[PDB]
């Protein structure tokens, strides 16, 4: 993993030593090279996980997240290099440094073999996304939204830390494979219940679970485009990866402690999809859609079925890609109209035919069109949930109906209809953002073609 | 569509509107032309024999009773013209009425594809600038300092002047653009 | 009532400028400035059949024989109908006929 970590680290001297007229080009090209280098972790011919060193390893679950991060970083630079043209050179290089630092720390997070190292890199990723959302946000309440995000994550993560040193004291090493082999069955006491809740609530906060999800919509409204990408495409999936890694040492009491959070996730995805029906803000609507999809991910991981693990893994990758793509479309419209109101621009299918095609393809990915990995993950979560209890199919049906409804309502009110003819400031298209849209959709097509790469731990 | 509605509808306007709507629902019920002509003559006779009313309070009462009768006897699915609102072909070509300002955003290659049209377009834009300044002055002069104000607009009151706010009427897209 | 003289004079000016705009919407004769037929049976229906049908037939028939029949259970079919009095091509026996049909009314 060091052969991916070191040149990503060396991207920072590249950023700070490049010419001002060559910085974006150099960093984008070399970060694409970083993604191509990170593609070598898919060489998995056998079940022995690629333990490269005593502190770094690759896994059928960890590899798609690392590849997704390394692929998203050049796309992040592409999306963020248009709203920073009227800005200082040192601040542009600082923003590029923040994105590169996030990408580095996320690779080490997903490749860490130690849960303490995972927590350290967890807060290490918590810091610069706060800096991005607070410094480069647009209107006033970016600060207060960042305060919610930071302190939800911290109040979640602190009992996780306490449970981590307690588990280290009880076992001895806290290494993931050693815990996986010498897993001990808990005797189901209230102290064990509190230990379970302590090591679960951090990932429950940063998924986000329903009721504690208040930080996410205003954060995605208030963040820049790269911030929206980093949260909605990597950080929730980091929470779910941490949940999967920590859930192995929590047998047997997770079978009854999983009861309230499954219900919370099912009702949460239904009510957040209803909010997406009755929502006047595009970015917050995409944020609540992300809340619903991550509620599905919670439901799968908590019912703790091998189909549920596969469906969670594909929903992770597919939702990250399609949520970044949806946020890119919303950002392109936002830089056109200098507004985030969903109803202000209506007839964009007229002026932007290709961008409306990208809009339609993104929404079709969002509403789980077959044979895409979106519906593959959603259907396998549905099958595992029906295996867990036959009555979950009603909640699934309501969620799927409202999901298709808000996606097609998005398309109808943002592309179709009469054009607002008063909108003189409609530039035709940027080759940069169209390239970004293609670089979002084409990996979805490739992963639809070969869904075996994002199966996960189980099968 | 080309005339703004007033503050209130007069009694004569309401009677004429009810007469036209009743005749439309009459032909929707009657279908056949001779039957429609007969019953339209009957309805015209009814309106004529209630026309010469002097009380005007009984005339408003008759209008209310006629509206109640019309709402009771109206066709559930009346005939609607294809271009009328609620029609089959209404708003069909709104996907093709592209506004004129994308021609500014056209590329110089597509500029060179249509040279004479774009020269005429530049001439129209220059005329628009000069007429806009003059008509801003005219509309500032014409507005009453206080009192009642309607949505109608004044015309050009001297030679070489264009009427104020003429651009979105003159340069509106064609109803059959393709 | 009819048109007020303010709107009556305005509309004729808006209509007059509308004819000028629609006349300018016309195209000059040079617009736009852009930068072996045989018969239908002999030519038009011939090259299409040998290019869009015959060439994809070769690629499909290459796939369905050397990449499908080489796989175990790709192309599986139901057994054909075997009636009395038939002869098996593969094995070679004759299926014995039926009984005497005691009823011959119709």
């Amino acid at each position: 993993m060091l052969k991916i970590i070191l040149p990503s680290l060396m991207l920072l001297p590249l950023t700070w030593l490049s010419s001002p007229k060559k910085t974006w080009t150099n960093v984008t090209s070399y970060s694409f090279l970083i993604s191509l280098t990170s593609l070598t972790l898919l060489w998995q011919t056998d079940e022995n996980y690629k333990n490269f060193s005593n502190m770094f390893s690759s896994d059928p679950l960890s590899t798609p997240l690392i590849i997704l991060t390394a692929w998203l970083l050049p796309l992040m630079l592409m999306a963020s290099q248009n709203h920073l043209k009227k800005d200082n050179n040192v601040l542009q290089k600082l923003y590029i440094s923040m994105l590169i630092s996030l990408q580095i720390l996320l690779i080490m997070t997903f490749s860490a073999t130690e849960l303490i190292m995972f927590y350290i890199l967890f807060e290490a990723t918590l810091i610069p996304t706060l800096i991005i959302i607070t410094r480069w946000g647009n209107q006033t309440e970016r600060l207060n939204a960042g305060i919610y995000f930071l302190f939800y994550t911290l109040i979640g993560s602190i009992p996780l830390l306490i449970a981590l040193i307690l588990i280290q004291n009880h076992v001895g090493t806290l290494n993931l494979m050693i815990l996986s082999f010498t897993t001990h069955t808990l005797d189901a006491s209230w102290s064990n219940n509190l230990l379970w809740l302590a090591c679960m609530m951090a990932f429950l906060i940063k998924m986000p679970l329903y009721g504690v999800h208040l930080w996410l919509p205003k954060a995605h409204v208030e963040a820049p485009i790269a911030g929206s990408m980093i949260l909605a495409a990597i950080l929730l999936k980091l929470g779910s990866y941490g949940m999967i890694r920590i859930s192995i040492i929590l047998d047997p009491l997770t079978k009854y402690m999983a009861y309230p959070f499954i219900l919370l996730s099912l009702w949460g995805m239904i009510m957040t999809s209803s909010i997406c029906l009755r929502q006047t803000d595009l970015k917050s609507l995409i944020a609540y859609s992300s809340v619903s999809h991550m509620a599905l991910v919670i439901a799968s991981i908590m019912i703790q079925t091998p189909w549920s693990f596969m469906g969670a893994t594909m929903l992770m990758i597919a939702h990250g890609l399609t949520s970044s793509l949806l946020f890119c479309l919303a950002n392109s419209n936002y830089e056109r109209i200098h507004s985030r109101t969903m109803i202000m621009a209506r007839g964009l299918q007229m002026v932007f035919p290709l961008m409306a095609t990208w809009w339609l393809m993104a929404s079709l990915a969002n509403l789980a069109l077959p044979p895409s990995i979106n519906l593959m993950g959603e259907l396998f979560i549905t099958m595992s949930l029906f295996s867990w209890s036959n009555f979950t199919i009603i909640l699934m049906g309501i969620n799927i109906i409202i999901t298709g409804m808000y996606s097609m309502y998005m398309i109808i009110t943002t592309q179709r209809g009469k054009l607002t003819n008063h909108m003189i400031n409609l530039q035709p298209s940027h080759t940069r953002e169209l390239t970004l849209m293609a670089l979002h959709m084409i990996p979805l097509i490739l992963l639809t073609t070969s869904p075996k790469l994002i199966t996960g731990l189980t099968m | 569509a080309f005339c703004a509605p007033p503050a209130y509808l007069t009694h004569q306007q309401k009677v004429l509107r009810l007469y036209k709507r009743a005749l439309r629902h009459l032909e929707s019920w009657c279908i056949h032309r001779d039957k429609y002509r007969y019953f339209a003559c009957l309805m015209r006779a009814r309106f004529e024999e209630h026309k010469n009313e002097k009380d005007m309070m009984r005339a408003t009462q008759l209008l209310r009773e006629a509206e109640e009768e019309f709402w009771q006897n109206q066709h559930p699915q009346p005939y609607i013209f294809p271009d009328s609102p609620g029609g089959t072909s209404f708003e069909r070509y709104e996907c093709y009425k592209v506004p004129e300002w994308c021609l500014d955003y056209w590329h110089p290659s597509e500029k060179a594809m249509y040279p004479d049209y774009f020269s005429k377009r530049e001439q129209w834009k220059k005329l628009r600038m000069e007429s806009w300044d003059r008509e801003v002055k005219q509309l500032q002069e014409e507005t009453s300092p206080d009192g009642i104000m309607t949505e109608a607009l004044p015309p050009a009151r001297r030679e070489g002047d264009l009427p104020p706010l003429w651009w979105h009427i003159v340069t509106r897209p064609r109803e059959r653009p393709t | 009532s009819g048109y007020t003289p303010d709107e009556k004079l305005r509309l004729q000016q808006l209509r007059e400028l509308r004819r000028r705009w629609l006349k300018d919407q016309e195209l000059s004769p040079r617009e736009p400035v852009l930068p072996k037929n045989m018969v239908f049976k002999a030519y038009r229906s011939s090259l299409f059949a040998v290019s869009h049908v015959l060439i994809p037939m070769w690629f499909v028939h290459y796939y369905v024989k050397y990449h499908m029949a080489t796989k175990p259970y790709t192309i599986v079919s139901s057994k054909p109908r075997i009636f009395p009095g038939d002869t098996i091509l593969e094995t070679g026996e004759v299926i014995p006929p039926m009984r005497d049909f005691p009823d011959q009314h119709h």
Binding site: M350, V351, F352, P353, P428, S429, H430, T431 | K97, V98, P99, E100, C102, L103, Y105, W106, H107, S109, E110, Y114, Y117, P173, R174, P177, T178 | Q25, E26, L27, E31
Partner: peptide, 13 residues
Amino acid sequence: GKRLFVVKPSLYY
């Protein structure tokens, strides 16, 4: 004849 100019967005990009 009577060809009329059709209004289209900038599809060049």
